């Protein structure tokens, strides 16, 4: 990462990420973890994070596909002049450079710490997150329509499932509709505009 | 966090927080842990802490609601001038900026390290803690009225339960009332103004 | 802590303390651990240490009581001038300021790093330790009078129990008296002034 | 590593690598881990990484063989002048120097931090990775031709196996061919040019 | 420790020591560990190490006794002038100051970083090690005279026990004498002056 | 270690080493680990590493013997002038000084950071490694002559055992000779000059 000087990604960071993906798979909270562990990361750093994941290769291939789509759109909006670059001068990044596949770390650092910056790390991270969001939505096991409160399920546990699902598929009305009959009666009686807090206290 | 320069949240910090919320849920001591792990945090840092929590999504939604209430009150007391901001100058933060949803890290650092500072990290942390306090009180399993000393419960174990409950629901009189008959006799005989220490030694 | 600049308490430190209190409860060695983990700590730091403890709330309440007693005595000996403080100047700390309940971290740092210093961290730590000492003595399970060497207990194991107890309740004569008959005979025969080393070798 | 000054490889780094090779053997993701843990490494550092591996000595011998092949090719393209080197001057590296077997750390640092640099760490790392790639391909247990979707295997689990295999042996057409009859029917009906995402949603 | 500036003992260091004493008790290697973990330590640091040990209070009392003996001898050889010390000047350390019981950390740092230094940390560490050596010898379970090679004990395992014992009680002749009859025959036949290496190869 | 300033050996480093020797004993990879963990170490540092090992005291005694042999040879080649050394000047190291038994850390640092340096850490490390190599060879359980491929042993597993053994005892011809009849037939048919890679692919 660039913290301005460059510092190698730490083994602690790498290991934390790889373990999260191992334990959580693609639960929604994995995206914030990725974003939080990669602050100021270069494209090379980001590729270390993705490439050290051993499992989930279907997902990782989908991710490459999304990245390639964004890289091709980058090339469309920002064509680079073909031909020998000015001796000693910073060149223009193309999509594959931003994605760190055809750029060196030295070049990435140069872009990222230039004045003004070409924020290749930040641009790449956006493409990755776009791809991760698709994966999170795909691996969500259950439709929000199928999250319904059980006959003996505490309201809080139901609300946990409801919002966990909503977060993945990435409301209060459906929330009341999908509640069991005893809670629904209480909830409807609350009237319009009840906060979640008021609903949860009511069905406690 | 801002320690003045900015430093990325550490994986150790993130992991510690996420594990606390996993193991303790919303026991009262989680609030001091949050406050202790987020010293000098920016709004982006604080959002990393909240967003990496995978479970308890009912609570996390309640928390968003409280934050939105405080953000709307911030907007009421401190309206921001609409229109193109002065070239190169620091803009005024609105509620969503303080909450880090419509502000960049660069802007947060600028506010927080300005002279004088606009302490957006400290303002946001107060809103979060206000929200966490409501959650702690909601998830408290038992009324202080129902914490009563068992027939064969050591006084110390009862006092532990009593003050643990009190802390969550966020005294000595109720304490004596809820004691068992053998201890209550001893306690009443102590007279008024006994310290906890004296009561505990008496019923040992 | 102040190490002169301020640095946030580390998660490692916090976690170490919380685990010690979990595993050891209030065994005597917990006090030196507290003192060793909080070197140069501000009142805010010290409160993080105490407040993140989840259990033992009877003890933690006793501790608050002792702190309040010391704070009231501080106020007695060092009254603070009431009224608007001199613009831009350092104010006098009262008891609740030293205890970090009515003071900000900024003020604590100012006091602690002033010339000469008002050592609020060191003053508060003394009050806490005074309170912890009372708790250690209260939670000591057994009277030194009841630590007696078993018929088949090795002398070393008995001496371990004897001094562990003594440390908590916070000698050689009682030590010999409480020894079993076979060791007592050997010990008495040693004569006066024997070192612990000589006694232990004799009963080996 | 060189981070410009030299810093010893960290025990954390060493331990992380040795554990990866223990747990993952030569699964493909081990190569990115190696590359990510050895950023800016000297030849001495790289040799520490390889030499501390206790098992897999067949692989480690194959790796030495590949390194020796690259070192002999280096000598072919870049012969070094034989005879006493200029007093106090930097000498030319031969293959065994780059591989760190006949060079000192001091010399490696000198080459790597010279102007312009002789990037011996980067050159050696390329030879190692070339060797590791051969090993990964050799230890791949199964031909991509034998990765076929089971009758009751979810499409996602099959795609995971397919791309994990492809990565090791280091497509969509074979992917559809090797699918079970129920998914193949759906896939063929999608028409040409379907993304992985579309195929996976279709067979979900 | 003093590394010249002072730095607080680390929780990692403290925890490592306390765990060693827990797991190894007073096996001989504990002394080198103590010495290695306390490099440049002040008396306060050293007291943190000793005082955080929860068990073995017989040993810890013996250790205090030895320290007091050395402190009284220090006072004998280096009496301190009684009376008000020169305003603002460094005072002379007595035994209890070196042992850190009547000296502040500030004073210890002053002594240790003075020109020339009064090396109170190094002097105290010597007294502690003297005390630890006595404890190690006391807790050695078995006489070197009783370490004899079993009928089916491999020579290497016997030699391990022999030198482990010797280290605690703190040779080749006894080594050969205590060997079993089959090895003794081989050893005697080696002649005088055999290295351990030669003996071990012979009885392999 | 000297990194130029001196820094105390880290508890992490110490603990890593002690654990390696516990788990691996004297498997060959322990030597590279020792060398990698002790970069720039002083003689005092190296002695911490050796002395904190609790087990294997036969080996540790053999190691002392080898060190003493090298120290006596050092004294033979580099005699030190006897008599009072020049006030304030650096003295000449003898063997026991290099081995850190009669030298202080201060003197070691002085030698190691002098211009030109007397590299006592590097000289001692060579003696230790010489001693460790003898131990590794002694504790190798099996002759390379006895490493033969089992009737149903995969070729790769056999090659692993063969090179692991070779490394300890510290080839392709013996490799083919010791192979089982089915692989030997294939191997012989490969002709001369086959790489390990080609042999392993052939017998896969």
mmCIF file of C-alpha atoms in Angstrom, chain B:
data_model
loop_
_atom_site.group_PDB
_atom_site.id
_atom_site.type_symbol
_atom_site.label_atom_id
_atom_site.label_comp_id
_atom_site.label_asym_id
_atom_site.label_seq_id
_atom_site.Cartn_x
_atom_site.Cartn_y
_atom_site.Cartn_z
ATOM 1 C CA UNK B 1 -7.291 6.813 12.604
ATOM 2 C CA UNK B 2 -5.604 10.188 13.015
ATOM 3 C CA UNK B 3 -2.640 9.767 15.350
ATOM 4 C CA UNK B 4 -0.925 14.518 13.084
ATOM 5 C CA UNK B 5 -1.161 11.982 10.267
ATOM 6 C CA UNK B 6 -3.667 9.380 9.085
ATOM 7 C CA UNK B 7 -3.078 5.662 9.498
ATOM 8 C CA UNK B 8 -5.233 2.847 8.161
ATOM 9 C CA UNK B 9 -7.264 0.870 10.680
ATOM 10 C CA UNK B 10 -5.265 -2.228 11.629
ATOM 11 C CA UNK B 11 -6.451 -5.787 10.876
ATOM 12 C CA UNK B 12 -5.761 -6.589 14.520
ATOM 13 C CA UNK B 13 -8.173 -3.851 15.612
ATOM 14 C CA UNK B 14 -10.849 -4.911 13.092
ATOM 15 C CA UNK B 15 -10.498 -8.557 14.040
ATOM 16 C CA UNK B 16 -10.652 -7.793 17.772
ATOM 17 C CA UNK B 17 -13.890 -5.870 17.358
ATOM 18 C CA UNK B 18 -15.574 -8.425 15.129
ATOM 19 C CA UNK B 19 -14.650 -11.179 17.599
ATOM 20 C CA UNK B 20 -15.966 -9.235 20.576
ATOM 21 C CA UNK B 21 -19.324 -8.761 18.871
ATOM 22 C CA UNK B 22 -19.302 -12.474 17.987
ATOM 23 C CA UNK B 23 -18.558 -13.692 21.495
ATOM 24 C CA UNK B 24 -20.210 -11.052 23.719
ATOM 25 C CA UNK B 25 -23.062 -10.022 21.429
ATOM 26 C CA UNK B 26 -24.364 -6.808 23.043
ATOM 27 C CA UNK B 27 -23.343 -7.296 26.652
ATOM 28 C CA UNK B 28 -22.710 -3.820 28.137
ATOM 29 C CA UNK B 29 -18.883 -4.055 28.078
ATOM 30 C CA UNK B 30 -19.018 -4.040 24.276
ATOM 31 C CA UNK B 31 -19.607 -0.270 24.289
ATOM 32 C CA UNK B 32 -16.393 0.578 26.158
ATOM 33 C CA UNK B 33 -14.560 -1.853 23.850
ATOM 34 C CA UNK B 34 -15.924 -0.027 20.797
ATOM 35 C CA UNK B 35 -14.891 3.315 22.249
ATOM 36 C CA UNK B 36 -11.452 2.052 23.220
ATOM 37 C CA UNK B 37 -10.727 0.462 19.822
ATOM 38 C CA UNK B 38 -11.762 3.542 17.831
ATOM 39 C CA UNK B 39 -9.693 6.336 19.390
ATOM 40 C CA UNK B 40 -9.178 9.122 16.858
ATOM 41 C CA UNK B 41 -11.106 7.159 14.221
ATOM 42 C CA UNK B 42 -12.440 8.810 11.081
ATOM 43 C CA UNK B 43 -16.016 8.185 9.953
ATOM 44 C CA UNK B 44 -14.631 5.750 7.359
ATOM 45 C CA UNK B 45 -12.849 3.832 10.149
ATOM 46 C CA UNK B 46 -16.022 3.702 12.238
ATOM 47 C CA UNK B 47 -17.985 2.384 9.278
ATOM 48 C CA UNK B 48 -15.398 -0.368 8.785
ATOM 49 C CA UNK B 49 -16.009 -1.404 12.378
ATOM 50 C CA UNK B 50 -19.796 -1.500 12.044
ATOM 51 C CA UNK B 51 -19.937 -2.890 8.502
ATOM 52 C CA UNK B 52 -17.660 -5.891 9.089
ATOM 53 C CA UNK B 53 -20.065 -7.318 11.646
ATOM 54 C CA UNK B 54 -21.797 -10.204 9.908
ATOM 55 C CA UNK B 55 -24.512 -11.131 12.376
ATOM 56 C CA UNK B 56 -26.978 -9.156 14.474
ATOM 57 C CA UNK B 57 -28.431 -7.385 11.436
ATOM 58 C CA UNK B 58 -31.587 -6.391 13.374
ATOM 59 C CA UNK B 59 -29.351 -4.455 15.768
ATOM 60 C CA UNK B 60 -27.294 -3.011 12.923
ATOM 61 C CA UNK B 61 -30.454 -1.764 11.257
ATOM 62 C CA UNK B 62 -31.633 -0.150 14.500
ATOM 63 C CA UNK B 63 -28.238 1.485 14.685
ATOM 64 C CA UNK B 64 -28.589 2.946 11.175
ATOM 65 C CA UNK B 65 -31.990 4.317 12.208
ATOM 66 C CA UNK B 66 -30.550 6.106 15.235
ATOM 67 C CA UNK B 67 -27.685 7.484 13.169
ATOM 68 C CA UNK B 68 -30.175 8.813 10.609
ATOM 69 C CA UNK B 69 -32.160 10.493 13.387
ATOM 70 C CA UNK B 70 -29.015 12.244 14.662
ATOM 71 C CA UNK B 71 -27.940 13.169 11.136
ATOM 72 C CA UNK B 72 -31.331 14.791 10.473
ATOM 73 C CA UNK B 73 -31.014 16.748 13.720
ATOM 74 C CA UNK B 74 -27.514 17.829 12.694
ATOM 75 C CA UNK B 75 -28.961 19.137 9.437
ATOM 76 C CA UNK B 76 -31.615 21.023 11.402
ATOM 77 C CA UNK B 77 -29.106 22.815 13.638
ATOM 78 C CA UNK B 78 -26.369 23.273 11.012
ATOM 79 C CA UNK B 79 -27.762 23.799 7.483
ATOM 80 C CA UNK B 80 -25.147 23.853 4.709
ATOM 81 C CA UNK B 81 -25.141 26.553 2.052
ATOM 82 C CA UNK B 82 -26.340 25.056 -1.228
ATOM 83 C CA UNK B 83 -24.411 25.811 -4.410
ATOM 84 C CA UNK B 84 -20.883 25.463 -5.876
ATOM 85 C CA UNK B 85 -18.310 25.599 -3.087
ATOM 86 C CA UNK B 86 -15.394 28.050 -3.153
ATOM 87 C CA UNK B 87 -12.659 26.584 -5.383
ATOM 88 C CA UNK B 88 -10.064 24.775 -3.259
ATOM 89 C CA UNK B 89 -11.792 25.451 0.032
ATOM 90 C CA UNK B 90 -13.071 23.123 2.756
ATOM 91 C CA UNK B 91 -16.847 22.594 2.555
ATOM 92 C CA UNK B 92 -19.323 22.379 5.458
ATOM 93 C CA UNK B 93 -20.201 18.832 6.571
ATOM 94 C CA UNK B 94 -23.841 17.715 6.565
ATOM 95 C CA UNK B 95 -25.140 14.758 8.585
ATOM 96 C CA UNK B 96 -24.438 12.160 5.892
ATOM 97 C CA UNK B 97 -20.886 13.526 5.575
ATOM 98 C CA UNK B 98 -20.277 13.112 9.286
ATOM 99 C CA UNK B 99 -21.732 9.610 9.043
ATOM 100 C CA UNK B 100 -19.214 9.060 6.253
ATOM 101 C CA UNK B 101 -21.743 8.042 3.612
ATOM 102 C CA UNK B 102 -21.383 11.108 1.372
ATOM 103 C CA UNK B 103 -17.848 12.193 2.348
ATOM 104 C CA UNK B 104 -14.460 10.929 1.209
ATOM 105 C CA UNK B 105 -11.643 9.948 3.552
ATOM 106 C CA UNK B 106 -9.680 12.904 2.211
ATOM 107 C CA UNK B 107 -12.456 15.287 3.273
ATOM 108 C CA UNK B 108 -12.758 13.610 6.678
ATOM 109 C CA UNK B 109 -9.026 14.004 7.298
ATOM 110 C CA UNK B 110 -9.281 17.643 6.199
ATOM 111 C CA UNK B 111 -12.114 18.399 8.602
ATOM 112 C CA UNK B 112 -10.531 16.485 11.482
ATOM 113 C CA UNK B 113 -7.057 18.059 11.077
ATOM 114 C CA UNK B 114 -8.215 21.614 10.315
ATOM 115 C CA UNK B 115 -7.646 24.662 12.507
ATOM 116 C CA UNK B 116 -9.892 24.792 14.252
ATOM 117 C CA UNK B 117 -11.044 21.173 13.704
ATOM 118 C CA UNK B 118 -14.488 20.040 12.662
ATOM 119 C CA UNK B 119 -14.336 16.854 14.760
ATOM 120 C CA UNK B 120 -16.456 14.630 12.482
ATOM 121 C CA UNK B 121 -15.019 11.412 13.920
ATOM 122 C CA UNK B 122 -15.911 12.436 17.447
ATOM 123 C CA UNK B 123 -19.376 13.634 16.476
ATOM 124 C CA UNK B 124 -20.152 10.417 14.605
ATOM 125 C CA UNK B 125 -18.823 8.264 17.452
ATOM 126 C CA UNK B 126 -21.298 9.960 19.796
ATOM 127 C CA UNK B 127 -24.223 9.077 17.485
ATOM 128 C CA UNK B 128 -23.034 5.458 17.264
ATOM 129 C CA UNK B 129 -22.691 5.136 21.035
ATOM 130 C CA UNK B 130 -26.170 6.605 21.496
ATOM 131 C CA UNK B 131 -27.404 3.875 19.157
ATOM 132 C CA UNK B 132 -25.383 1.136 20.822
ATOM 133 C CA UNK B 133 -26.755 2.121 24.247
ATOM 134 C CA UNK B 134 -30.307 1.558 22.999
ATOM 135 C CA UNK B 135 -29.321 -1.865 21.659
ATOM 136 C CA UNK B 136 -27.594 -2.880 24.888
ATOM 137 C CA UNK B 137 -30.719 -1.961 26.830
ATOM 138 C CA UNK B 138 -32.949 -3.847 24.399
ATOM 139 C CA UNK B 139 -30.905 -7.072 24.496
ATOM 140 C CA UNK B 140 -30.686 -7.129 28.309
ATOM 141 C CA UNK B 141 -32.410 -10.464 29.050
ATOM 142 C CA UNK B 142 -33.772 -9.776 32.519
ATOM 143 C CA UNK B 143 -35.355 -7.039 34.606
ATOM 144 C CA UNK B 144 -33.437 -5.839 37.644
ATOM 145 C CA UNK B 145 -36.673 -6.651 39.487
ATOM 146 C CA UNK B 146 -36.140 -10.328 38.695
ATOM 147 C CA UNK B 147 -32.564 -10.507 39.975
ATOM 148 C CA UNK B 148 -33.099 -12.132 43.353
ATOM 149 C CA UNK B 149 -30.642 -14.068 45.482
ATOM 150 C CA UNK B 150 -31.214 -17.825 45.445
ATOM 151 C CA UNK B 151 -31.593 -19.823 48.707
ATOM 152 C CA UNK B 152 -28.111 -21.313 48.286
ATOM 153 C CA UNK B 153 -26.568 -18.615 46.090
ATOM 154 C CA UNK B 154 -23.442 -17.027 47.595
ATOM 155 C CA UNK B 155 -23.979 -13.298 48.159
ATOM 156 C CA UNK B 156 -21.074 -12.392 45.851
ATOM 157 C CA UNK B 157 -22.563 -14.292 42.894
ATOM 158 C CA UNK B 158 -25.919 -12.544 43.420
ATOM 159 C CA UNK B 159 -24.272 -9.117 43.612
ATOM 160 C CA UNK B 160 -22.426 -9.919 40.361
ATOM 161 C CA UNK B 161 -25.747 -10.683 38.636
ATOM 162 C CA UNK B 162 -27.414 -7.614 40.143
ATOM 163 C CA UNK B 163 -24.798 -5.121 38.956
ATOM 164 C CA UNK B 164 -24.321 -6.841 35.575
ATOM 165 C CA UNK B 165 -28.073 -6.404 35.012
ATOM 166 C CA UNK B 166 -28.077 -2.817 36.259
ATOM 167 C CA UNK B 167 -25.245 -2.013 33.896
ATOM 168 C CA UNK B 168 -27.191 -3.279 30.881
ATOM 169 C CA UNK B 169 -30.588 -1.809 31.735
ATOM 170 C CA UNK B 170 -28.414 1.291 32.250
ATOM 171 C CA UNK B 171 -29.768 0.427 44.320
ATOM 172 C CA UNK B 172 -28.371 -0.835 47.623
ATOM 173 C CA UNK B 173 -31.957 -0.660 48.846
ATOM 174 C CA UNK B 174 -33.258 -2.933 46.078
ATOM 175 C CA UNK B 175 -30.063 -4.944 46.594
ATOM 176 C CA UNK B 176 -31.055 -5.677 50.199
ATOM 177 C CA UNK B 177 -34.717 -6.267 49.291
ATOM 178 C CA UNK B 178 -33.807 -8.847 46.612
ATOM 179 C CA UNK B 179 -31.364 -10.703 48.930
ATOM 180 C CA UNK B 180 -32.360 -14.075 50.476
ATOM 181 C CA UNK B 181 -33.777 -14.170 54.041
ATOM 182 C CA UNK B 182 -30.518 -15.135 55.790
ATOM 183 C CA UNK B 183 -28.492 -12.358 54.182
ATOM 184 C CA UNK B 184 -31.290 -9.809 54.406
ATOM 185 C CA UNK B 185 -31.369 -10.306 58.172
ATOM 186 C CA UNK B 186 -27.626 -9.638 58.377
ATOM 187 C CA UNK B 187 -27.817 -6.675 55.983
ATOM 188 C CA UNK B 188 -30.725 -4.938 57.737
ATOM 189 C CA UNK B 189 -28.787 -5.311 60.996
ATOM 190 C CA UNK B 190 -25.843 -3.411 59.477
ATOM 191 C CA UNK B 191 -27.811 -0.172 59.610
ATOM 192 C CA UNK B 192 -27.900 2.622 57.004
ATOM 193 C CA UNK B 193 -24.944 3.729 54.890
ATOM 194 C CA UNK B 194 -23.097 0.416 54.638
ATOM 195 C CA UNK B 195 -20.646 0.259 51.745
ATOM 196 C CA UNK B 196 -20.866 -2.626 49.278
ATOM 197 C CA UNK B 197 -17.620 -3.880 50.789
ATOM 198 C CA UNK B 198 -19.175 -4.054 54.263
ATOM 199 C CA UNK B 199 -22.284 -5.824 52.980
ATOM 200 C CA UNK B 200 -20.247 -8.405 51.074
ATOM 201 C CA UNK B 201 -17.958 -9.111 54.042
ATOM 202 C CA UNK B 202 -21.042 -9.459 56.267
ATOM 203 C CA UNK B 203 -22.701 -12.079 54.040
ATOM 204 C CA UNK B 204 -19.508 -13.967 53.218
#
